[PDB]
Amino acid sequence: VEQKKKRTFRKFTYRGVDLDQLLDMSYEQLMQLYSARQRRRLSRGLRRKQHSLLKRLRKAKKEAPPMEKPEVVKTHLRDMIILPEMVGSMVGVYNGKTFNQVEIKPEMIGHYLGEFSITYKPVKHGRPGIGATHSSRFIP
Amino acid sequence: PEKFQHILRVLNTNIDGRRKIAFAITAIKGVGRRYAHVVLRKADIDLTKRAGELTEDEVERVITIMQNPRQYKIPDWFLNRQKDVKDGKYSQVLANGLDNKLREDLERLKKIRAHRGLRHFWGLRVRGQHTKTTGRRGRTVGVSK
Amino acid sequence: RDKLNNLVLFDKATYDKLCKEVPNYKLITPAVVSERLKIRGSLARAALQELLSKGLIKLVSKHRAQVIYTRNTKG
RNA sequence: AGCAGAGUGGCGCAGCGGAAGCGUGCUGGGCCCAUAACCCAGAGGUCGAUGGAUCGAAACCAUCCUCUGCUACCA
RNA sequence: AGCGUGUGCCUACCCUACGCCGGCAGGCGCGGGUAACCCGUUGAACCCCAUUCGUGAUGGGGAUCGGGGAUUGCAAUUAUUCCCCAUGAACGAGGAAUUCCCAGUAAGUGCGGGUCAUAAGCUUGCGUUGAUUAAGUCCCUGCCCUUUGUACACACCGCCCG
RNA sequence: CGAGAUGGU
């Protein structure tokens, strides 16, 4: 990663804990660090057949060459919360017609996968057409 | 009267010593009507006097209470920074510290390029609002060719 | 565009005038005291209660939105 | 060299010792079923250098700079 | 105050008193109602009485934006709705134009019904406080009837000349 | 007795 200190030692962490500690914590402990929406989702959420993504991610983390990035796993699951299991991983997130790849930085923790893959193009205007103003009227 | 000093400087900001004490200290950023009343109530100050009628040790009692709310038993549910994301603390942030705390929050969203960080960067409405008919700040454009 | 500059506390040049002017006025009210002495309405409210306990003026009427006072029963 | 103009705030014409000046052009709105005529509102603002009176300087007054205009010459 | 609604017949959800925990949104327990029977004497808002501010873009105004907590749901990010501390824009009664209204009316003020798993700045009803100005005209925009003129009948937004 | 031209569906 580009930056020192973060989640490793001293004053930059998540909520006061290090990445190696977030990797020891259970879902029952971890839901005290997350905010109210993520806490409700983990408390209520049986996650029935949503564990399949976590299996494919941990397969790709296991089988990658030593000191090189995993291959992409590509998915429709835009409403998945980023767990501390998912850091340093490649995901392709569906956009309504294409998959956009994401390298999951540890600062992304507690966000949704769908927050990093955007459904539209930023607008830039062409000149106004006929009917755009009351004076614009056409007579043959 | 005593012809005492009627402008005073408190936290790198100037207070008019001429308003009621509970409405003079809200010239500090991070101190609203609701928080200013509770600080003076813990500080044991009479709310009826003008801000130029406080003695030198009374202003130091108010300043030392504003900077350490949790040791004078001001509740956690009152504070403007709750579980701060990088170190987990609870506090009230004031003056030029509030400017930097927002400056760090907008750059933290931009660095990972989340949707919030892109809307703040392009200068668009960040919360759920529509943009077809409100917030207009350009110039009228003519149809002619 | 303009500004008033009304006082928040007295000084002797205006406090001695408050005590000298009492017999001159048929109608005494916080607003007429405010504009005539250049005093805020909250100081005008406070000053007229002291003169009443000193016995120098008569209360004619009181209501939330309007007090009225007058000269001490002669002239 | 004699005498005069310019040195935009919006193309263009340059008012008078008060921070647009008015006729006009551009852009938008009203009126009408609709187009013209008519009516109304907009346009990010030390206007070449150096001194002096002013509440004030493109616009009251010095001294330099440059190009035009009419005369007409240091060339 | 007055008008109303209430356990959904496939379709799976209703209206709530009382006690206890919490600043709040909210949570747990335990009863009544298929309704002139229970929520309910439906303790509504403006208004009324007392206090503080003092002509200041101010203690007027509350847009924009940071952080945290609950509830619906299979799922809330492009923020469902709700609660808390903080931030504190334009705006000082609005140019040419233009809408609605004659008495329990206009305007002010809050409450039900619809849509509804979650939810009114809309709409359709109800009560409460309660004026100023008129009792007329055909001028402007239109409608009805009669006499009259026409080169119109696609009917004046017509037809037609150099 | 102010000024009052014109007409793709």
XYZ file of C-alpha atoms (C1' of nucleotides) in Angstrom:
606
model
C 0.000 0.000 0.000
C 1.157 3.636 -0.655
C 1.058 4.915 2.990
C 2.813 4.095 6.328
C 1.442 3.688 9.940
C -2.315 3.020 9.107
C -3.853 0.011 11.021
C -0.264 -1.083 11.895
C 0.926 1.079 14.885
C 0.180 4.321 16.884
C -2.505 6.948 15.990
C -4.060 5.630 12.682
C -6.324 2.527 13.075
C -10.005 1.609 12.628
C -11.945 2.659 15.830
C -8.703 2.039 17.870
C -7.695 -1.500 16.564
C -4.980 -2.868 14.216
C -5.496 -5.008 11.052
C -4.045 -8.165 12.729
C -6.620 -7.665 15.578
C -9.542 -7.190 13.115
C -8.355 -10.555 11.617
C -8.628 -12.223 15.112
C -12.096 -10.793 16.034
C -15.343 -12.784 15.570
C -18.451 -11.306 13.832
C -19.956 -10.956 17.379
C -17.011 -8.708 18.481
C -16.549 -6.918 15.108
C -20.198 -5.640 15.071
C -19.304 -3.375 18.088
C -16.813 -1.442 15.834
C -19.163 -1.035 12.819
C -21.861 1.725 12.709
C -25.646 1.176 13.223
C -26.582 0.164 9.587
C -23.717 -2.382 9.288
C -24.454 -3.637 12.870
C -28.176 -4.243 11.990
C -27.191 -6.036 8.715
C -24.723 -8.384 10.519
C -27.116 -8.983 13.500
C -30.228 -9.725 11.315
C -28.405 -11.250 8.309
C -28.327 -15.071 8.018
C -26.392 -14.472 4.693
C -28.010 -17.584 3.071
C -25.779 -18.532 0.053
C -23.896 -15.144 0.255
C -20.911 -17.014 1.859
C -20.095 -18.374 -1.682
C -18.275 -15.104 -2.580
C -16.101 -15.393 0.588
C -15.125 -18.996 -0.443
C -14.082 -17.814 -3.968
C -12.151 -14.846 -2.492
C -10.215 -17.054 0.021
C -9.469 -19.596 -2.783
C -7.973 -16.745 -4.890
C -5.944 -15.405 -1.860
C -4.613 -18.988 -1.180
C -3.645 -19.956 -4.768
C -1.926 -16.723 -5.992
C 1.896 -16.846 -6.675
C 4.081 -15.601 -3.748
C 4.256 -11.757 -3.597
C 1.868 -11.254 -6.592
C -1.826 -10.137 -6.861
C -4.763 -12.655 -7.119
C -6.917 -13.010 -10.267
C -10.335 -11.227 -10.284
C -13.509 -12.798 -8.876
C -16.500 -11.145 -10.671
C -19.936 -10.731 -9.021
C -23.439 -9.097 -9.033
C -23.419 -8.647 -5.163
C -23.361 -4.783 -4.958
C -24.900 -4.741 -1.404
C -22.090 -6.821 0.259
C -20.344 -5.030 3.196
C -16.508 -5.024 3.081
C -15.371 -7.356 5.929
C -11.702 -7.420 7.183
C -11.395 -10.869 5.438
C -11.653 -9.058 2.030
C -8.576 -6.695 2.221
C -5.832 -6.951 -0.455
C -8.176 -8.696 -2.956
C -9.360 -8.183 -6.577
C -13.161 -7.991 -7.237
C -15.083 -7.239 -10.480
C -18.382 -5.503 -9.516
C -21.275 -5.445 -12.052
C -22.446 -2.039 -13.363
C -25.712 -2.868 -15.245
C -23.706 -3.909 -18.405
C -19.959 -4.422 -17.489
C -17.725 -5.498 -14.549
C -15.398 -2.825 -13.066
C -12.348 -4.141 -11.167
C -11.531 -2.945 -7.607
C -8.332 -3.485 -5.551
C -9.712 -3.510 -1.971
C -7.653 -1.051 0.145
C -8.102 -1.412 3.971
C -9.635 2.135 4.124
C -12.670 0.667 2.246
C -13.731 -1.398 5.363
C -17.450 -1.114 6.285
C -18.432 0.342 2.821
C -20.565 -1.535 0.215
C -18.947 -3.147 -2.893
C -21.428 -1.150 -5.070
C -19.979 2.213 -3.819
C -16.818 1.841 -6.027
C -18.510 0.973 -9.410
C -20.788 3.746 -10.759
C -23.937 3.266 -12.864
C -23.690 6.352 -15.193
C -21.386 8.830 -17.088
C -20.802 12.407 -15.737
C -22.788 14.946 -17.871
C -21.131 17.492 -20.226
C -23.507 19.638 -22.299
C -24.109 20.120 -26.011
C -25.863 23.324 -27.266
C -29.685 23.743 -26.626
C -32.211 22.519 -29.263
C -35.536 23.775 -30.719
C -38.292 24.210 -28.057
C -35.805 24.885 -25.177
C -37.153 28.502 -24.651
C -40.452 30.353 -25.473
C -38.818 32.546 -28.227
C -37.404 29.441 -30.116
C -40.560 28.812 -32.270
C -40.344 27.635 -35.945
C -42.713 28.756 -38.781
C -42.277 27.245 -42.324
C -20.380 49.296 35.340
C -16.652 49.757 36.411
C -15.880 50.788 32.730
C -14.386 47.261 32.325
C -13.106 45.676 29.049
C -16.045 45.123 26.566
C -14.226 43.180 23.763
C -12.224 40.015 24.726
C -10.241 37.230 22.916
C -10.902 33.603 23.993
C -9.796 30.833 21.505
C -8.074 32.708 18.614
C -11.501 34.428 18.072
C -12.997 37.725 19.362
C -16.035 37.873 21.703
C -18.156 41.038 22.081
C -18.344 41.752 25.868
C -21.795 43.323 25.252
C -24.244 40.377 24.731
C -25.669 38.084 27.506
C -22.951 35.526 28.460
C -24.830 32.474 27.038
C -25.116 34.190 23.561
C -21.587 35.742 23.513
C -19.581 32.434 23.578
C -21.487 31.030 20.509
C -19.064 33.186 18.433
C -16.661 30.174 18.845
C -17.038 27.474 16.099
C -18.258 24.171 17.654
C -20.386 25.934 20.382
C -24.154 26.319 19.658
C -27.029 27.671 21.854
C -27.685 24.228 23.391
C -24.014 23.475 24.298
C -23.228 27.033 25.567
C -26.080 26.840 28.165
C -24.853 23.438 29.546
C -21.185 24.625 29.824
C -22.183 27.718 31.900
C -24.482 25.498 34.083
C -21.504 23.174 34.951
C -19.188 26.238 35.371
C -21.518 27.738 38.102
C -22.051 31.107 36.305
C -25.233 33.238 36.580
C -26.800 33.524 33.064
C -28.221 37.073 33.751
C -24.906 39.056 33.365
C -23.274 40.619 30.224
C -20.086 38.919 28.908
C -17.835 41.898 29.952
C -18.859 41.335 33.648
C -16.902 38.024 34.040
C -13.632 38.138 36.047
C -10.280 36.747 34.760
C -10.627 33.439 36.714
C -14.288 32.972 35.563
C -13.291 32.953 31.834
C -10.457 30.453 32.576
C -13.053 28.202 34.343
C -15.319 28.316 31.214
C -12.367 27.712 28.783
C -11.042 24.711 30.796
C -14.613 23.222 30.862
C -15.128 23.659 27.033
C -11.870 21.754 26.253
C -12.555 18.731 28.595
C -16.378 17.996 28.720
C -16.171 14.315 29.871
C -14.297 15.116 33.156
C -17.040 17.642 34.235
C -19.750 14.959 33.520
C -21.175 16.393 30.248
C -22.823 13.272 28.600
C -21.398 11.323 25.610
C -24.676 11.789 23.623
C -24.020 15.608 23.592
C -20.691 15.616 21.688
C -19.944 16.593 18.015
C -17.191 13.909 17.411
C -18.351 10.358 18.336
C -16.043 7.247 17.947
C -13.617 9.222 15.684
C -12.817 6.821 12.795
C -8.974 6.722 13.160
C -8.579 6.397 17.020
C -12.034 5.629 18.614
C -12.275 8.692 20.978
C -15.271 10.866 22.014
C -14.789 14.707 22.130
C -16.031 18.209 21.172
C -13.945 19.849 18.343
C -13.677 23.681 18.337
C -12.263 26.705 16.408
C -9.587 25.902 13.719
C -9.625 22.190 14.797
C -13.156 21.799 13.291
C -11.924 23.161 9.900
C -9.116 20.540 9.782
C -11.444 17.684 10.941
C -13.753 18.342 7.929
C -10.638 18.787 5.656
C -9.436 15.280 6.670
C -12.946 13.734 6.172
C -13.292 14.969 2.532
C -9.755 13.757 1.568
C -10.364 10.311 3.242
C -13.452 9.866 0.964
C -11.551 11.106 -2.164
C -8.431 8.831 -1.711
C -10.451 5.549 -2.049
C -12.641 7.296 -4.771
C -16.024 6.408 -3.221
C -19.208 8.040 -4.718
C -19.360 10.733 -1.897
C -15.742 11.789 -2.677
C -16.461 12.161 -6.433
C -19.660 14.285 -5.843
C -17.713 16.572 -3.415
C -14.933 16.867 -6.086
C -17.217 17.609 -9.123
C -19.119 20.216 -6.979
C -22.561 18.494 -7.223
C -25.254 17.823 -4.526
C -23.875 15.082 -2.225
C -27.090 13.904 -0.461
C -30.145 12.512 -2.321
C -31.448 15.741 -4.028
C -32.545 16.167 -7.694
C -30.529 18.611 -9.919
C -32.795 19.491 -12.935
C -34.467 22.659 -11.452
C -32.727 23.828 -8.175
C -29.199 25.028 -7.205
C -28.654 26.974 -10.516
C -25.517 29.268 -10.439
C -24.442 29.688 -14.121
C -25.746 32.030 -16.904
C -28.791 31.922 -19.276
C -27.916 30.289 -22.682
C -29.525 31.372 -26.000
C -30.901 28.980 -28.699
C -29.505 30.915 -31.748
C -27.088 29.516 -34.416
C -28.366 52.422 5.205
C -27.712 53.409 8.867
C -26.950 52.146 12.472
C -28.081 53.029 16.027
C -25.515 52.674 18.886
C -27.600 52.198 22.094
C -25.803 51.717 25.492
C -25.921 48.433 27.573
C -25.002 50.049 30.979
C -25.240 53.637 32.344
C -22.554 56.306 32.937
C -22.963 59.365 35.279
C -23.815 61.874 32.479
C -26.907 59.723 31.571
C -27.694 58.273 35.054
C -27.946 61.773 36.652
C -30.170 62.737 33.648
C -32.432 59.693 34.393
C -32.987 61.078 37.960
C -33.319 64.790 36.843
C -35.847 64.155 33.988
C -38.512 62.250 36.121
C -40.962 65.240 36.626
C -40.806 66.376 32.946
C -42.777 63.480 31.349
C -46.580 62.873 31.482
C -46.045 59.397 29.909
C -43.131 57.156 31.034
C -42.556 53.896 29.058
C -39.432 51.742 28.188
C -39.491 52.726 24.454
C -39.675 56.556 25.012
C -36.846 56.255 27.614
C -34.824 54.113 25.104
C -34.986 56.578 22.159
C -34.589 59.752 24.331
C -31.574 58.598 26.454
C -30.035 56.299 23.685
C -30.498 53.175 25.890
C -31.431 49.487 25.032
C -35.019 48.354 25.824
C -33.736 45.788 28.415
C -31.848 48.545 30.310
C -34.936 50.824 30.007
C -37.077 47.981 31.548
C -34.554 47.573 34.425
C -34.172 51.350 35.132
C -37.966 51.958 35.432
C -38.358 49.186 38.078
C -35.745 50.907 40.343
C -37.590 54.290 40.229
C -40.848 52.489 41.214
C -39.261 50.940 44.383
C -37.697 54.386 45.180
C -41.343 55.685 44.996
C -40.524 58.359 42.319
C -43.138 57.320 39.639
C -46.651 55.699 39.530
C -47.476 52.468 37.659
C -50.641 53.162 35.574
C -50.966 49.718 33.891
C -49.092 46.392 33.281
C -49.440 43.623 30.626
C -46.864 41.225 28.947
C -46.609 43.439 25.815
C -47.029 46.976 27.391
C -46.174 48.671 30.750
C -47.304 52.298 31.428
C -45.987 54.752 34.116
C -46.680 58.450 34.995
C -45.515 61.432 37.160
C -45.966 61.302 40.981
C -49.666 62.444 41.396
C -49.287 66.254 40.762
C -48.981 68.771 37.832
C 5.224 69.535 -36.923
C -0.069 72.779 -36.254
C -5.024 71.441 -34.248
C -8.401 67.263 -32.818
C -9.960 62.110 -31.332
C -8.929 57.296 -28.859
C -6.703 54.315 -24.623
C -14.869 49.993 -22.896
C -18.392 47.588 -18.887
C -20.918 44.300 -23.499
C -20.192 44.839 -31.183
C -20.469 49.761 -32.575
C -21.374 55.767 -31.768
C -17.819 58.328 -27.796
C -21.387 61.585 -22.979
C -20.810 65.717 -18.773
C -16.240 67.509 -13.826
C -20.921 61.787 -9.690
C -18.959 55.101 -10.026
C -22.350 53.332 -18.118
C -24.125 57.878 -21.118
C -28.129 57.684 -24.589
C -30.064 56.143 -29.581
C -28.549 51.112 -31.352
C -26.870 45.633 -31.528
C -27.021 40.727 -28.696
C -29.511 37.387 -24.974
C -33.998 36.113 -21.962
C -39.196 37.155 -20.196
C -44.430 39.515 -20.991
C -48.638 40.453 -24.419
C -51.336 36.889 -28.699
C -54.211 30.945 -30.879
C -49.240 32.350 -33.245
C -45.397 35.639 -35.988
C -44.112 40.977 -36.562
C -45.042 45.893 -33.938
C -44.977 47.423 -28.623
C -43.468 46.680 -23.221
C -39.638 45.049 -19.331
C -34.929 43.037 -17.462
C -29.900 41.176 -17.966
C -23.818 41.225 -19.392
C -17.796 39.020 -13.184
C -15.149 45.145 -14.232
C -8.913 51.328 -11.004
C -10.466 52.917 -19.437
C -1.083 53.279 -21.501
C 2.991 55.827 -17.777
C 4.369 59.890 -13.453
C 2.627 64.149 -10.312
C -1.748 67.291 -7.840
C -6.991 69.588 -5.745
C -11.358 66.185 -4.541
C -16.505 62.636 -1.150
C -14.473 61.233 -6.921
C -11.159 60.143 -11.888
C -11.837 57.162 -18.860
C -14.530 61.729 -17.938
C -11.027 68.934 -13.175
C -5.452 70.041 -14.255
C -0.135 69.183 -15.442
C 4.026 65.920 -17.975
C 5.311 61.783 -21.041
C 3.623 57.599 -24.850
C 1.318 55.826 -29.638
C -1.822 55.514 -33.962
C -5.239 57.739 -36.789
C -8.136 62.310 -38.806
C -7.627 67.429 -41.480
C -3.692 70.795 -42.529
C 0.889 69.261 -44.404
C 6.466 69.087 -42.398
C 12.102 67.512 -38.342
C 12.250 62.366 -42.766
C -63.555 20.549 18.695
C -65.949 18.004 14.576
C -65.938 14.530 10.457
C -63.738 9.265 10.410
C -60.912 4.536 10.734
C -59.770 -0.224 13.390
C -57.808 -7.823 13.951
C -57.505 -8.383 5.385
C -62.493 -13.663 4.041
C -56.517 -15.893 -1.915
C -53.662 -11.899 -0.019
C -51.467 -12.924 6.474
C -50.580 -6.612 8.106
C -55.279 -3.977 12.573
C -56.580 0.503 16.718
C -54.364 0.944 21.581
C -54.979 1.831 27.707
C -51.830 0.587 32.050
C -46.832 -0.934 34.513
C -41.385 -1.106 33.994
C -36.078 0.306 31.270
C -33.850 4.779 28.167
C -32.174 12.189 27.057
C -34.525 10.855 22.521
C -36.279 7.832 18.374
C -37.357 3.151 20.720
C -37.693 -1.737 23.768
C -40.171 -5.615 27.273
C -44.521 -7.263 29.902
C -49.765 -7.675 30.248
C -55.081 -6.335 29.247
C -59.694 -4.284 26.021
C -62.043 -3.817 21.159
C -65.284 -7.538 15.059
C -66.970 -1.453 18.149
C -73.044 4.578 21.122
C -69.639 -0.996 24.839
C -62.271 -0.643 23.995
C -58.086 3.474 22.484
C -62.004 7.970 24.362
C -64.787 12.796 28.729
C -60.951 11.755 21.365
C -56.833 17.035 27.811
C -55.736 19.530 19.058
C -53.308 24.105 17.036
C -53.821 29.287 16.615
C -55.598 32.075 20.819
C -55.035 33.321 26.480
C -51.481 34.794 31.267
C -46.240 35.544 33.065
C -40.729 35.729 31.630
C -36.147 36.843 28.611
C -34.138 39.633 23.928
C -33.827 45.322 21.958
C -33.958 47.574 15.499
C -28.312 44.438 15.064
C -28.954 39.636 8.473
C -30.112 39.935 15.446
C -31.978 35.157 20.223
C -35.377 36.945 12.421
C -34.553 32.764 8.354
C -32.990 27.461 8.220
C -30.847 26.196 2.869
C -26.059 23.470 2.534
C -22.787 19.967 4.874
C -19.616 16.511 9.081
C -20.031 12.595 12.981
C -23.072 9.021 15.942
C -28.009 6.008 17.420
C -32.962 3.354 16.430
C -37.176 1.306 13.445
C -39.452 -1.221 8.358
C -37.640 -4.879 4.899
C -35.393 -10.556 1.319
C -32.075 -5.894 0.370
C -31.505 1.139 2.399
C -24.716 3.131 -1.333
C -27.137 7.347 -5.992
C -28.066 9.277 1.449
C -36.530 5.052 2.890
C -38.385 7.255 7.266
C -37.112 8.861 12.414
C -33.658 10.884 16.795
C -29.051 13.760 18.675
C -24.591 17.497 18.763
C -22.411 20.751 15.122
C -22.430 24.202 10.396
C -25.449 28.847 9.624
C -26.754 30.613 2.495
C -30.200 33.786 -0.307
C -33.815 36.767 1.709
C -35.297 43.915 4.471
C -42.118 42.926 1.050
C -40.482 41.870 -4.876
C -39.782 44.885 -12.858
C -43.257 44.433 -17.365
C -47.368 41.226 -16.366
C -51.290 38.204 -13.939
C -55.052 34.567 -10.550
C -59.206 33.755 -6.958
C -63.058 35.865 -4.111
C -69.526 38.924 -1.763
C -70.819 36.122 4.924
C -69.811 31.943 9.352
C -67.540 33.882 3.086
C -61.704 35.510 2.277
C -57.517 34.644 5.183
C -55.187 32.399 9.635
C -54.960 27.385 12.427
C -54.662 22.278 13.339
C -57.097 17.151 12.652
C -59.162 12.529 9.750
C -59.612 9.630 4.901
C -56.789 7.820 0.115
C -52.202 5.778 -1.556
C -49.247 2.566 2.903
C -44.117 -3.448 4.625
C -41.677 1.699 5.388
C -43.871 7.628 4.302
C -46.857 14.247 2.734
C -44.415 20.023 1.055
C -50.479 16.468 -3.088
C -55.653 15.721 -2.930
C -60.578 14.885 -0.704
C -63.532 15.975 3.800
C -64.124 18.361 9.227
C -64.137 21.731 13.054
C -61.998 26.328 15.363
C -60.645 32.264 15.289
C -63.203 35.596 11.932
C -62.612 41.089 8.778
C -62.171 45.338 5.062
C -65.191 46.547 0.406
C -70.322 46.084 -3.105
C -75.818 45.872 -3.397
C -73.619 48.310 -9.447
C -72.193 48.780 -14.822
C -71.278 47.356 -20.143
C -65.835 50.312 -20.232
C -62.089 45.607 -21.039
C -62.742 39.932 -22.072
C -67.034 36.959 -23.247
C -72.491 34.898 -23.570
C -78.146 35.354 -25.094
C -82.060 37.738 -28.424
C -83.551 41.000 -32.558
C -82.726 44.414 -37.063
C -78.660 45.052 -40.871
C -74.428 44.222 -44.661
C -71.172 40.484 -47.164
C -67.146 38.670 -52.951
C -67.309 34.073 -46.305
C -69.667 28.044 -45.958
C -62.343 24.780 -44.990
C -67.317 29.438 -42.298
C -62.449 36.384 -40.197
C -57.127 31.841 -37.610
C -62.213 33.189 -44.072
C -61.403 35.231 -49.061
C -58.099 38.197 -52.189
C -54.563 42.376 -55.614
C -49.883 44.370 -58.037
C -62.882 59.546 -34.143
C -54.499 57.838 -31.133
C -51.929 53.348 -33.219
C -54.517 48.006 -34.731
C -50.290 44.331 -40.622
C -50.421 38.738 -41.284
C -51.999 32.923 -41.330
C -48.135 24.613 -42.316
C -50.817 20.562 -40.079
